[PDB]
Write a structure and sequence with these properties.
Elements: E1 10-12, E2 35-38, E3 45-53, E4 56-63, E5 70-71, E6 78-85, H1 100-108, E7 118-119, E8 124-132, E9 143-150, E10 156-158, E11 164-166, H2 169-176, E12 179-182, E13 185-191, E14 209-219, E15 227-232, E16 235-243, E17 267-268, E18 272-281, E19 290-298, E20 301-302, E21 309-311, E22 313-322, E23 326-337, E24 340-341, E25 347-355, E26 363-372
Parallel strand pairs: 16-24
Antiparallel strand pairs: 1-3, 2-6, 3-4, 4-26, 5-6, 6-25, 7-25, 8-19, 8-26, 9-15, 9-25, 10-11, 10-14, 12-13, 13-14, 15-16, 16-18, 17-18, 19-22, 20-21, 22-23
Bound molecules: calcium ion.
PDB class: lyase
Keywords: Heparin, polysaccharide lyase, beta-jelly roll, Lyase
Assembly: monomeric
Amino acid sequence: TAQTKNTQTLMPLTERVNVQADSARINQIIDGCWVAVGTNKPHAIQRDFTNLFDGKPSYRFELKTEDNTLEGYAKGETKGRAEFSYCYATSDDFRGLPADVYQKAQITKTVYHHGKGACPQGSSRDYEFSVYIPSSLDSNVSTIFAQWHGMPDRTLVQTPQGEVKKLTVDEFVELEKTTFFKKNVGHEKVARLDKQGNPVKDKNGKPVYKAGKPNGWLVEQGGYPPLAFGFSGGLFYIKANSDRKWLTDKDDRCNANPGKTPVMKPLTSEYKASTIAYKLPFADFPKDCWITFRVHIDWTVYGKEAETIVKPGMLDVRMDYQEGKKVSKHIVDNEKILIGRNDEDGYYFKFGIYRVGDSTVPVCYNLAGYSER
Ligand SMILES: [Ca+2]
């Protein structure tokens, strides 16, 4: 290859923030309102000066076949991620607080709870964003391009004796000194030891540990997104999830498959629901043009420790695009639906690529034009 690459049309954006565990620095924030999460390969996220949305650069996301960097549920499964998050904290957000507050928020993974861009429990919000799906996108991709997640606080725990309780941050910080967490499961924290019997340290002198046996503690971590827009099995779909349990049970994998679950017939467990609100065959999803989605969500209201449904939620979605003339398809019409999570804290938006279902089919598309109110 002898042609010098044109690097004017695309600009890699490679800064990444673990929003639960770290504040975003000013020079990591994109357009004053986003931070990026996931793989930092230069091609993963780029500002696109050629495909403009409303006259301004859009965002091109790409995962190649080899770009799954995350472990999936079952052994042998991987997932890939390159997303923007609308919710993150900055240094400014901790102004006025004691010196140790930020470090304890890092340990409890509650940093972004101090930042902008979240919607509280039981509230209502309108969201709008646009997507551009290239005609080259494989119809068998398995990817989520917009999703709204909950924000559980892992200081809600279950003790080894089975009590669900809220630890103070200081209590959780003490527990973390003795417990190694693998996702939501506590394990005895054991120091790795070198051949002389001394604690192992990495090249920088940080003590290294590993998980011993499970120690009975569980923490509220992870969970399905309450709302996701994606492609799977040759379908565009919109999926809403609900969990009314106070401490989510991670072994309850209530997740509707759009190829198996009829539209608006919820898959339910004792505490969870997963509903496919809309499906469209892949070939019918417009290509090589900007599609604007307008989404209204009334989040389900849950009864906290009572685990009740206090008020159902509601989802409304319109899909607008050029058809010569602007048309607006009312793809989800004011549907009463269970949508949300029974947590103290609320919900935040991401868009980009979250490649799921143990897929390595390449994904590439553009996103732009986000707003919420
Ligand atoms: Ca919860």
